[PDB]
Write an enzyme that holds these catalytic residues in place. Sequence first.
Site, PDB file in Angstrom:
ATOM      1  N   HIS D 248       0.822  -1.206   0.000  1.00 50.22           N
ATOM      2  CA  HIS D 248       0.000   0.000   0.000  1.00 50.22           C
ATOM      3  C   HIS D 248       0.858   1.259   0.000  1.00 50.22           C
ATOM      4  O   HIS D 248       0.552   2.228  -0.707  1.00 50.22           O
ATOM      5  CB  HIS D 248      -0.909  -0.070   1.230  1.00 50.22           C
ATOM      6  CG  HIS D 248      -1.729   1.151   1.478  1.00 50.22           C
ATOM      7  ND1 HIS D 248      -1.264   2.214   2.222  1.00 50.22           N
ATOM      8  CD2 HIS D 248      -2.989   1.476   1.100  1.00 50.22           C
ATOM      9  CE1 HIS D 248      -2.205   3.140   2.293  1.00 50.22           C
ATOM     10  NE2 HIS D 248      -3.259   2.718   1.617  1.00 50.22           N
ATOM     11  N   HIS D 253       0.917   5.007  -2.638  1.00 55.93           N
ATOM     12  CA  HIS D 253       1.315   6.357  -2.257  1.00 55.93           C
ATOM     13  C   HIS D 253       2.547   6.869  -2.991  1.00 55.93           C
ATOM     14  O   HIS D 253       2.529   7.984  -3.518  1.00 55.93           O
ATOM     15  CB  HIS D 253       1.595   6.425  -0.744  1.00 55.93           C
ATOM     16  CG  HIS D 253       0.372   6.431   0.119  1.00 55.93           C
ATOM     17  ND1 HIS D 253      -0.461   7.527   0.219  1.00 55.93           N
ATOM     18  CD2 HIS D 253      -0.153   5.486   0.936  1.00 55.93           C
ATOM     19  CE1 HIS D 253      -1.449   7.254   1.052  1.00 55.93           C
ATOM     20  NE2 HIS D 253      -1.285   6.022   1.505  1.00 55.93           N
ATOM     21  N   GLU D 293      -6.877   8.574  -0.286  1.00 55.92           N
ATOM     22  CA  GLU D 293      -7.023   7.137  -0.064  1.00 55.92           C
ATOM     23  C   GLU D 293      -7.932   6.461  -1.093  1.00 55.92           C
ATOM     24  O   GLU D 293      -7.525   5.480  -1.716  1.00 55.92           O
ATOM     25  CB  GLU D 293      -7.467   6.834   1.373  1.00 55.92           C
ATOM     26  CG  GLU D 293      -7.338   5.357   1.756  1.00 55.92           C
ATOM     27  CD  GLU D 293      -5.892   4.889   1.917  1.00 55.92           C
ATOM     28  OE1 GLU D 293      -4.992   5.737   2.097  1.00 55.92           O
ATOM     29  OE2 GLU D 293      -5.653   3.665   1.857  1.00 55.92           O
ATOM     30  N   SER D 312      -3.291   0.370  -4.816  1.00 54.91           N
ATOM     31  CA  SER D 312      -2.670  -0.817  -4.250  1.00 54.91           C
ATOM     32  C   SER D 312      -3.651  -1.972  -4.092  1.00 54.91           C
ATOM     33  O   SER D 312      -3.347  -2.927  -3.377  1.00 54.91           O
ATOM     34  CB  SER D 312      -2.028  -0.506  -2.900  1.00 54.91           C
ATOM     35  OG  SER D 312      -3.018  -0.196  -1.950  1.00 54.91           O
TER      36      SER D 312
END
Lengths: 411, 406, 412, 413
Positions: D248, D253, D293, D312
């Site tokens: 993730h 990110h 997110e 992700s």
Amino acid sequence: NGAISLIFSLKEEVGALAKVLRLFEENDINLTHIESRPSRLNKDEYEFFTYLDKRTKPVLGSIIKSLRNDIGATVHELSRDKEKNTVPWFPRTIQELDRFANQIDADHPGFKDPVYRARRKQFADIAYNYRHGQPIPRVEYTEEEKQTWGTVFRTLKALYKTHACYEHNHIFPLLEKYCGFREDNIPQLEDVSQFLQTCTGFRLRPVAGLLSSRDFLGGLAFRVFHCTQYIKHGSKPMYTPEPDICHELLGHVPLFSDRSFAQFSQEIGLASLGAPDEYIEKLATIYWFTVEFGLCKEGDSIKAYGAGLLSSFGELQYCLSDKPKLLPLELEKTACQEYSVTEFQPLYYVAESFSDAKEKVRTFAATIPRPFSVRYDPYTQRVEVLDNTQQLKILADSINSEVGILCNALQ
Amino acid sequence: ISLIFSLKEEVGALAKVLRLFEENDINLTHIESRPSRLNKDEYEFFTYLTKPVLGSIIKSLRNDIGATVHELSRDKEKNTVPWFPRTIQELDRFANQILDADHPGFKDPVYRARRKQFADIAYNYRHGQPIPRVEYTEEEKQTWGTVFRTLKALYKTHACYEHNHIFPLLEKYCGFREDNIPQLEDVSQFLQTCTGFRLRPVAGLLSSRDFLGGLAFRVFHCTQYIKHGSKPMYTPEPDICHELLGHVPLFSDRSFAQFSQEIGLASLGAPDEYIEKLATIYWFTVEFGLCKEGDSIKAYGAGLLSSFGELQYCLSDKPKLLPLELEKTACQEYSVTEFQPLYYVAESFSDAKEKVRTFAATIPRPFSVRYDPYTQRVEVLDNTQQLKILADSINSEVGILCNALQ
Amino acid sequence: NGAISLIFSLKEEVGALAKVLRLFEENDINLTHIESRPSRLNKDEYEFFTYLDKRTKPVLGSIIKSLRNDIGATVHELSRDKEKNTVPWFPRTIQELDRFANQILDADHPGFKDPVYRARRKQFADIAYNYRHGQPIPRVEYTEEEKQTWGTVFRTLKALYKTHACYEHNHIFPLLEKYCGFREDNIPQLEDVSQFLQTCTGFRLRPVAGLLSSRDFLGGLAFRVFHCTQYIKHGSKPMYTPEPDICHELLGHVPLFSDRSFAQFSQEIGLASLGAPDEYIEKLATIYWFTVEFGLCKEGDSIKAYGAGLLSSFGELQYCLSDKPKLLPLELEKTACQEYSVTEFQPLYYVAESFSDAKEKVRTFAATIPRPFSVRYDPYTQRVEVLDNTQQLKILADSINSEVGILCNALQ
Amino acid sequence: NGAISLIFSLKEEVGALAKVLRLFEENDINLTHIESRPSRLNKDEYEFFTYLDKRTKPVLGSIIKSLRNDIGATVHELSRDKEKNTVPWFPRTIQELDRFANQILDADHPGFKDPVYRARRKQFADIAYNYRHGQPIPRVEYTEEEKQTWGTVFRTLKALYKTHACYEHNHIFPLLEKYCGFREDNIPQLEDVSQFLQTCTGFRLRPVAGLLSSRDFLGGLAFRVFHCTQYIKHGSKPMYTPEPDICHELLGHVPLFSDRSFAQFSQEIGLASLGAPDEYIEKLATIYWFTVEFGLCKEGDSIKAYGAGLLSSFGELQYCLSDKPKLLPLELEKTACQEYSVTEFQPLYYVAESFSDAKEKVRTFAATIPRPFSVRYDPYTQRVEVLDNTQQLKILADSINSEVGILCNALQK
């Protein structure tokens, strides 16, 4: 005749002005049609203003290549007839609005009234003979015309305190003390123009009838409002599909007296200069949903600021009703929205503010295919055509100087 | 004895102001009421006031109505701002405040008659009107011709770039020839098309305050008579030759127009001490300035571009030169009669405008000024107001620059 | 070894990133000596950084010709030897100040016949030779002799700052005395000073063994990096000024390097140096000489000294505000050509209107310096970014319009 | 011990500085906890950064009382337990991220039965617990099992980034594979990625053991500091999503944080949090949940995903562009109130016009947040500047001034 205009800057060199002025001479063009002024941004350049028409077209092409390469200068060819590889014509000086000001029934509520038709020819003739600079000729209006004005005027004033936008209600009292906005007086355009002039630098210009959206909008670039001096036929005091003096003095004038509304409309006008046909239309649509039938937010409520609404008692109440559909101002959609002149508008676009709408228009104008940008010089009353690195350089120094003032003032 | 005050539209403010003046027998044509540009909520008032009971109104505007009131007196009344014209038309009000046996034309009855002729043209001129034209006599033209011929020859070498940049246009479009004296009305139209500068015929010598104030509106008070023919080289008194050959070309240049405009903006409401400083600054720039061009120095002062003998002296080795810094320049001593001992060099007109601006910030005034070319009005700004108009001005220019880069 | 660099950007298109990388791979240029990164301004372009040296010259011309004519990239060829119409080299990143930090310039020196001093001096040089960007600046215990020398200079000068130094110096000097041990009995550690600079204006210290060239020194100022000496002058002659010992650096430069407007002003001299022709390095050093080193500034009623060479030299600090020097307003086109010696008190000083003004003067001067680009330091990435596209200036103007839109909102 | 902080400035004036330092010192608040720095804007002022805790709290009122009254300084009081008439504390320097970087947040985790896995999470946790700002991030050789997991997650997403990820992700991703070891057979090292981020937008990774409070996490973004986990999810269930492992952090990110526009946007959320009431911290967390997110953004006529929770997660990445989700336009006043569930695919996504338009919506929203001041980050001193209305106009103006001067010089080239 049309109008041909060559926009090009030329660096001063020994013999530079000398030869380009002959480059007109060799081709035999008269040199009272070639006016050479110092560039306003580039200290070392000379800008040329050409007052030409189609008679000069034989030789324009040869001239351009020499200037293009024999002298190394960007030349923009402006033509009234909008033909192959030209920019649609537009006046570069405010006096040049003269050149097509005059370039202008069976169901009209005055078709069978020979007094009215003869009256309308009087106003037309006052407008046909108007030239920039002159005072606007005053006309005593008939008693029956002042009653039509009174009818229109009395009803609308009642709805203003509730339905009109703040800018409109803020200024209207000033027009009542200083410009004869009274139920019993039809104001003279010359007094109005003089009033606007001292407010925002807007000025009136009597027009015989309706101009093409291009011509009308191009005038907004100079803060010139092409205005009609006649009045609707007194039989139907609610008639609105043509813009009589009621539409002008009550729908347009108070807002043209506010800086932000003035700057906003001027922006629609700046965007029209050299715009292609397709984009004049989209600006007219944008115009129709802003200046003409615009609504604006005021805190938690919605108010009217469109001339066609501030002048039409009927649709002013309607548009504040829940019945009409409302959309926030969106240029990439507004410019393509359909509208019908005769019927009450189904849809109105709401505007955050005049300033925000000004920004959207400037943003929208970046989408208008033009080989240059435009900036109005209120000092010489002429349009600056921006297409150089070194011009933007001078503009940036100008911005930097103001920032220094802002900074120093903060301390 | 004018008044400048803003006012928020709260409980019927506009109407209270007008009733405040009616109750004081003041006609509403001496009450100019306009909306404010930066505050949607308020109005701008301007009265052309009837000296008796002016205290009664001011006390009411400040207290009962909660306004901030600037009191502008021309009669130097202590605790009042020194008056200045707010509108370009208000230059009419005092354009007629001018100031002889030494004169080279003292014994000439016709010359003594022309001067009166030109004075009355100036006296009778009011803003907006065309400048009255005059037919110059053959002897007036040869005098002009002697002056023109002798200086034109020095301009390629001794004159600044901007003067030489524009001079071919004046010759090309305003009859600038050794056998023609141009008409002011022609010159004025040209200027307007260049930088928006205007001409206003003036009988003679106004005070520094009045003259400088005119520049704030890009308005040049300009004489129309010509020096007497017996002494062509006589340059003492500002003569048409001074105005057209020394001032005009520079006034046509955007950056020189802005710099001279800046001196005039700085004078608006300036105490007399600061008028004398700005006049000295003016003396050492607009009138007798030299400027840097690469490694050489050229002349831009009107008193130099119209003076054959001092145009060549000034770029010589005889006078002392100092870089232009205004706190020192605004304190210099000069004399009208002789060749100047000292000159100040400027690196550019752009730079000179910045120096003047910084110097103006030190001028005590209860407000800041900014000229509006749209309405031909000077607007007075509180400290808070100035921030909003510059920022909004800045926001506009940046938009133009973003749109243009594409 | 020297130094060779290719400054170029490229729009992303299919395989473009990969075509550039093979071109350098083809020619033995490791992926560690060509790094690609996204452009700050243009969302769709990759900026390239080349860490090359002269051992790459045989092949550089072929690579350059491939980038321009095949790949179609605008390429600036940088050379430290200033070759055939190349731009003089300068580091793109702050780490790359390591590369030439050791390129340095005894007979009649006051500490010649002293073998402990000669040894201290080589101890301090080694610390510099071994320093690398990022490391803590090694601390050294100074002897009593050395802290007494420091004390003599410090004492005489402190009594004189109140009446002779500019306001900014005197504003910060108390903070240095309270938080960095700037006392008469204590020579402060470079690691503490650098940390205090960093928290003040982002300026950091970097020990250098001796005198760098003007190009290399000034270049460090673009990153707000001050190459600083760490030894102290010999104790025999504590007023000895003709070398920049730790007194000159800590009493002359450090207070001003902690002021934002002075920091930006000195940084502007370094931004202007990047790639400047040798002609304009000399002019920048001379400007530096009459501003950063021996400058004076107007302070309301009075003129005050701000040059490091005045604030660290008792005698000339008094002389320079007396009636003996010839003062002149700061005008760079003249000042840049002003001649001067290091031997004696300066006959002539230039007076700066202020730091923010001298900064704008220097920005104006840099536009006259022949370079095929202008430059902007990115304090986030601590990397220099070169501006040569209209596409860049578009973004640059948008971000401007954004802060203007923010400042307008904040006023109204 | 918590954290108390006083924010105040003082005009220089004979004796003023020593008189301020003394009222701290005389109350046994030694000089190491009171930094005094020249004010950037006010050339005659001093700013004071105080590093304190509950231990000082018996003497705080007196000190404040003299500061406000006997010295005439406007004093803001930051406290971490957020008593009334205090401002919820936040770090003012990038180093103070150390202070609570360890205030972290299992029988059902898909790794509870694996005793090697439990042990390894304690290794990564111990790297983070001992990690301090300025240190290189310890490099950790990953096992072959762990690398299998990374490959399963990697292969499926990369085959899907070209048509599902926004332009910015796809712009940087090729650079990460080339220079940070983003490969199907390799798990990158946090140190190499952090150094890459720093060369892009100034972002930097901070090894963190587990989940921080929203306040602490968001506040780090104001410094462009991303608190990042070093461990990887258990091998058995590589599609397991509830905890943010290295998959993730690196795939969701790291690309976007390398983009200038996105960096500025996410930082704007961080600057919004600093000192916000808990009510607006929750609003920010929801806004964050639907932007960084699980955000979608407009890209010409199409719509692409930019949320790390989507970039992700192969499964929900495909879902978020199908015709199944409900899409609304991003409106932070409405977004900030939107209900959401962590466990299932989001039924509702908020579409952004762009990262540039989203940043401005954030800033505007932040204006409504009750704070006795404004905040700006300064990348030179890596410290947050707290400013009043006047001071804010100054910095904005001098930033504008500097940037115009650059545009001026660059126009002539």
